[PDB]
């Protein structure tokens, strides 16, 4: 997250850390056995870290579940980045309390000029490098279709949607991906990609969630 703020431990409950030795993507918890998070964070061999600020020290509210399965969107293109979505399930039923919480599906899709909360452990720099150890958030708006589809000609589907500021500075970025957009207290996009972090006219693009839910319930029910 570049341009943002430090959330403060536990503050963004349902928020995971998927690990294969080192921090590599964010999640979702959406129940106790269940995170989504995006496609193209796909790998074998996932730990998810729930319950975490300081990715580097234990300190005290973290459980630590190895995925069982991992299940990638049937039409995700990792050329296009369409569909970019993906469902893993734990190997357990993680504690749920106050500091560790599912986040609920979007009833609907929400509309531009919504206020949202992004968040992750990615880069805060848009020149350079430089991770930081504790969870970062940033407050940002859902962008217009074509505010969106200005920016990034030919590259924005119905399944993607624009959020941040036109005019650069605060952006989501590297190592965010696949963690949570919440709007009104519900999941509506995944952290997906975008040109650099932070640039002007260049927004950052996110899964459009609500177009999934179907999908999700229903894979969650046979799985
Ligand atoms: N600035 C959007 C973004 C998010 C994740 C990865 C790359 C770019
Ligand atoms: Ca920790």
Not at 68 to 81: C, E, G
Not at 129 to 148: E, F, G, R
Request: hydrophobic fraction near 30%; charge should be positive; charged fraction near 10%.
């Amino acid at each position: 997250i570049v341009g943002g703020y430090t959330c403060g431990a536990n503050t963004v409950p349902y928020q995971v850390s998927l690990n294969s030795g080192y921090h590599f993507c964010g999640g979702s918890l959406i129940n106790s056995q269940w995170v989504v998070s995006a496609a193209h964070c796909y790998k074998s061999g996932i730990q998810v870290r729930l319950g975490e600020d300081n990715i580097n020290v234990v300190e005290g509210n973290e459980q630590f579940i190895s995925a069982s399965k991992s299940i990638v969107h049937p039409s995700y293109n990792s050329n296009t980045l369409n569909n970019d979505i993906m469902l893993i399930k734990l190997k357990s039923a993680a504690s749920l309390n106050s500091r560790v919480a599912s986040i609920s599906l979007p009833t609907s899709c929400a509309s531009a000029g919504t206020q949202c909360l992004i968040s992750g452990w990615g880069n805060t720099k848009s020149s350079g490098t430089s991770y930081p150890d504790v969870l970062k958030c940033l407050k940002a708006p859902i962008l217009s279709d074509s505010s969106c589809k200005s920016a990034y000609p030919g590259q924005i589907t119905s399944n993607m949607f624009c959020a941040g500021y036109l005019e650069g500075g605060k952006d989501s970025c590297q190592g965010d991906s696949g963690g949570p957009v919440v709007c009104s207290g519900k999941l509506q996009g995944i952290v997906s990609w975008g040109s650099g972090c932070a640039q002007k006219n260049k927004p950052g693009v996110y899964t459009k969630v609500c177009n999934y839910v179907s999908w999700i319930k229903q894979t969650i029910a046979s799985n």
